[PDB]
Paper text:
The engagement of a DNA glycosylase with a damaged DNA base marks the initiation of base excision repair.
Subsequently, the structures of apo NCP–50I and AAG–NCP–50AP complexes were solved at resolutions of 2.9 Å and 3.0 Å, respectively. Despite the overall high resolution of the AAG–NCP–50AP structure, the portion of AAG becomes highly fragmented in the sharpened map, indicating a conformational wobbling of AAG on the nucleosome. In the AAG–NCP–50AP structure, the engagement of AAG is similar to that in the AAG–NCP–30AP in general, although AAG in AAG–NCP–50AP is angled at ~60° against the plane parallel to the nucleosome disc. Globally, the buried surface area between the DNA and the histone core decreases from 7134 Å2 to 6248 Å2 in the presence of DI at –50, and further decreases to 5977 Å2 after engaging with AAG. Since the –50 position is closer to one end of the DNA than the –30 position, the large local DNA distortion around the damage site could have been relaxed by propagating to the end.
Author numbering:
A (entry chain C): 11 to 111
B (entry chain K): 82 to 199, 208 to 248, 255 to 295
C (entry chain E): 42 to 133
D (entry chain F): 20 to 102
E (entry chain D): 31 to 121
F (entry chain A): 38 to 134
G (entry chain B): 24 to 102
H (entry chain G): 11 to 118
The structure:
DNA sequence: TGGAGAATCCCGGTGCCGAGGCCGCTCAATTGGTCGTAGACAGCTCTAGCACCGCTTAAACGCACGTACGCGCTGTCCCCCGCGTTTTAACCGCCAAGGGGATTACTCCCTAGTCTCCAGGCCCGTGTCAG
DNA sequence: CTGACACGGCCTGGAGACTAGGGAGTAATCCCCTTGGCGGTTAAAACGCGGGGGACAGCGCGTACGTGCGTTTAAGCGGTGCTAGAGCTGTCTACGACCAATTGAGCGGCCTCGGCACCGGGATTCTCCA
């Protein structure tokens, strides 16, 4: 056999594209799953996780801490309009609320 | 007796210990009065404080890594997971070490066939240092044991060799690709082989 | 002055992330409610903590909507009619 | 073995703490009983759904998954417990 | 049990190297990844059944992302997925 | 002549437009509104007539529910006249932005 | 500018269906903005469903799927 | 062979058991579908259809009509509390609203 | 061809109201209702089977999906009617 | 309270078009048998859930006082309702012409299935740092 | 000053490679449904105007929450002990997928006639002023 290069590294991603392919297969979503669908879904999930972690790291840096706690995740989600639109119906445990009077 | 190697045999630097710990018999002395007669097929060598993959990199002076300033050839075990151990011998100089990797036995196959259990091919019978260290039943309580005293395990004299680079220490630093790991040629029981370093 | 301690309590209870209801009365309330649906139930600790997190977030959001209803009628005191108006508009 | 009215365990300072987290400057005296009733309704719905999820799996222990799936049903997803 | 913990480690080290993360925050991000994956895959299943196909391609995932995600998030997620699919098919 | 008091004609209209099931917005202006909104997304686009009827029924139902919540918001503030702050309150409680 | 086609008596009639007795003069512009936002949200999803199927026209099932996507399920147009 | 008896006819159901089986199998719900699940689901859908249809017929009788129109279905759903709770996010086309004027708007 | 739940809703209507007809728009609304409730119950049963690591939808999954979806009295009567139908299916 | 303008319902005829019944048939549901595996069933281990005791100790509770605030009352003035009149364009019907949805044949590429192998990721009890 | 988190064998699920068959892409055609314009009748909107009436501001009072302090209490933490049952594994059986032949049930088409919208006159309230 040839060199076993991982399919996640072929797309330049970090998320487990093979795991997304398997979870799409056994999740009973369609009879067959195309080749680029796990790549696209892993890239989209990686981008959304990266944006959440961007704003969470900035929130942790603004409060002078070097470790992301769920309060930072709540401020990161709710301080952006788009992520608050995506996670409007979602409660983050140990997340707190924003200061408004 | 005469078939025992003392502390004066190990008084060489790191790379002669890498050269002179190949093809020699390690006879573990179990309390039942039997023998094992295992021949080692590969070793590893850490030069000391100047090696990035060693445990004493950058002047590390942890109380567990202390067995080098009283005698050379000191037995050492470290926990690696959470139950596994490894076989280490201190070389000459502070921080220099040689790690045992794999051996092959010739008698008492049932002993580590049934003792290693907590699928049973001869190639994977003694491949991996942790389960063979468990097969010799050397725990963390034998870290203070000196190598060539009492009735315990010693070295026995036996009757090509290809050098390969470091594998599994990460793709960083300058000491992660030096060819010093010696393995015998033509042996099919070697766990990690180098197909590009065989042609030299 | 009447109101400044309330304002500092508002300011200090929004920066904190801790759980505002005591744990054991909530645990006993959950076991009392669950008795009517099934007899002799066991509960995990994470189940009761998940229930407390959901209940506290639900009550905080309901009190935000209640405060908007109270400020809408030109007063700063929340009343049960504000809760009922917000609760009907949210669909409950 | 039989638990009484433990709805009074959600005390008055707890409701005041939750309202001051919400941003409420003044609280009426009849707010508290309405809050007991609202909490009772919410816990009744979520606990009933989680107990249904529990007895479908033939278990006597209500798991964090049962409450998480109940809240995912009721339109309010709870992150942090393995959902 | 499988989780996305090491992948969120890798993303966080790419985006914020002097920043750690707790266990509770990683549980929240694992639940977030599972939730977004379930939303996008369920929408792709719905558009597969609506058009009488039995295949989830990149087009259904692209349209599901464009339906679910809000505006600038949708634009950048479509750009990222398109770059990933073109790079993966280029080799 | 005869002139009705303010409130009689409004309640007559409330009973008239709650007894009926008809559509209230004129169909052609709603069609033109749907066309100019859809031309901001994809140009040269056609529509089924049943699609515009579906959009009109959904929009009318949404506006009737919004005006009911607005009416309760105005009744809550000791008023009978609804104002834009009532609509803004109802949409803020409902979760719309 | 076809938003003025949603006339003031139409907004008054929709408020009459909602049981509203008195209406301020500034209600109509806010109602036009609300209706425009709602129609943009539904029509964008319907156009997206149309473009996925590679068609030039928006059907009733596309609008029904777009409204079911937002939790505003519509009966009587097929399903 | 034997006489062909319908699966709906042997469970006393008017709703089709086999069609519900085929819609479950092609619906991508699970890989396998048991025998009793289409029978159970057909009975449940038959009961809910009967519950709306009886109330809609009563509403059609109350408005001196022989046919059932969308207004009768909307009145039947919105006047029963369980069906209004079940269909709370459902817009019936040509349905109208319930006649409901508040007490503070009526004259004295 | 297009399949519909038209004749079955008509049969139920003639069974419960033997002198009452139905319009085309009303039949479209009832067909959409049957499709919506069927999709709701089957989606809930699929989620329940995936949560408990079961690859089949049995009568039990539909029973607990009906109990989760429908409000109380409707849920009780629907579970009783389904149990009666499955019992009549197995015994004959 | 009465009278009168005005809105609303009832009964009688009409004519219309959409529901409701019948029929040919094509497609999907039934019947019978086989075969492979998902899942019921019995049993065991060990996690963890419940029950009980006691000490600090913070939080809940009861009470006293005062003042901020809800709430009713009154004046007033803008602002919307109701109605008549004029302008404006929605709407019904029709022709037509063109785009485009929907169906069909085909031929092709891509994705499921499977066999083998190996490398990433999980499990885990001590080194070292950030609240 | 310490506890949560990171840096250290083996195993199983991803990956390469071959096969093959059917699902989706493409070209072509048929006709149903969309658009657009015109006439023309008219329902419906736009606009102006008067006036009632309701929103809104000011003010006074009475009471009911906030705030503070002392006494009570039971949460919270630590620890122990017992056992229900959660979770896993092994075995085997019956239950559902799958396939081929059969056949009748529902669907498209078509004909027909009876419920329902509509017009209209008279009875019956609705409302507003006097």
């Amino acid at each position: 056999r040839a060199k076993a290069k991982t399919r996640s590294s072929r797309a330049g991603l970090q998320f487990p594209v093979g795991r997304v392919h398997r979870l799409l297969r056994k999740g009973n979503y369609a009879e067959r799953v195309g080749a680029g669908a796990p790549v696209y879904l892993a890239a989209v999930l990686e981008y959304l996780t990266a944006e959440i972690l961007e704003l969470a790291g900035n929130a942790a840096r603004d409060n002078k801490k070097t470790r992301i706690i769920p309060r930072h995740l709540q401020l990161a989600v709710r301080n952006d309009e788009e992520l608050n639109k995506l996670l409007g119906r979602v409660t983050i445990a140990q997340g707190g609320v924003l200061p408004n009077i | 007796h005469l078939t025992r190697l003392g502390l004066e045999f190990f008084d060489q630097p790191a790379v002669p210990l890498a050269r002179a710990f190949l093809g020699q018999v390690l006879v573990r002395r179990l309390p039942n009065g039997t023998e094992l007669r295992g021949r080692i097929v590969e070793t590893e060598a850490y030069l000391g404080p100047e090696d990035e993959a060693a445990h004493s990199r950058g002047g590390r002076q942890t109380p567990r890594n202390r067995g080098m300033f009283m005698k050379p050839g000191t037995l050492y075990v470290y926990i690696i997971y959470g139950m596994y151990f490894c076989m280490n011998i201190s070389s000459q100089g502070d921080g220099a070490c040689v790690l045992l990797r794999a051996l092959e036995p010739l008698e008492g196959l049932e002993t580590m066939r049934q003792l290693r259990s907590t699928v049973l091919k001869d190639r994977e019978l003694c491949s991996g240092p942790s389960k063979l260290c468990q097969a010799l039943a050397i725990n963390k309580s034998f870290d203070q044991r000196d190598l060539a005293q009492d009735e315990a395990v010693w070295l026995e004299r036996g009757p090509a060799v290809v050098a390969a680079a470091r594998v599994g220490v990460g793709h960083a630093g300058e000491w992660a690709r030096k060819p010093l790991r010696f393995y015998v040629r033509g042996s099919p029981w070697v766990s990690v082989v180098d197909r590009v370093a065989e042609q030299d | 002055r009447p109101g400044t301690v309330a304002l500092r309590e508002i300011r200090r209870y929004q920066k904190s992330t801790e759980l505002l209801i005591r744990k054991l009365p909530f645990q006993r309330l959950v076991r009392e409610i669950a008795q009517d649906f099934k007899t002799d139930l066991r509960f995990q600790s994470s189940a009761v903590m998940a229930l407390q997190e959901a209940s506290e977030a639900y009550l905080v959001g309901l009190f935000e909507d209640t405060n908007l209803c109270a400020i809408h009628a030109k007063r700063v005191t929340i009343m049960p009619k504000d809760i009922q108006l917000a609760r009907r508009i949210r669909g409950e | 073995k039989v638990l009484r009215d433990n709805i009074q365990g959600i005390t008055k300072p707890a409701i005041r703490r939750l309202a001051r987290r919400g941003g409420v400057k003044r609280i009426s005296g009849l707010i508290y009983e309405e809050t007991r009733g609202v909490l009772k309704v919410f816990l009744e719905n979520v606990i009933r759904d989680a107990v249904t999820y529990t007895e479908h799996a033939k278990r006597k222990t209500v798991t964090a998954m049962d409450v998480v799936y109940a809240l995912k049903r009721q339109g309010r997803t709870l992150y942090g417990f393995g959902g | 049990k499988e989780s996305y913990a090491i992948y969120v480690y890798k993303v966080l080290k790419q985006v914020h190297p002097d920043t750690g993360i707790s266990s509770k925050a990683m549980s929240i991000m694992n639940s977030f990844v599972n939730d977004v994956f379930e939303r996008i895959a369920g929408e792709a299943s719905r558009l597969a059944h609506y058009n009488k196909r039995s295949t989830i391609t990149s087009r259904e995932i692209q349209t599901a992302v464009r339906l679910l995600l809000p505006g600038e998030l949708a634009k950048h997620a479509v750009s990222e997925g398109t770059k990933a699919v073109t790079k993966y098919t280029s080799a």
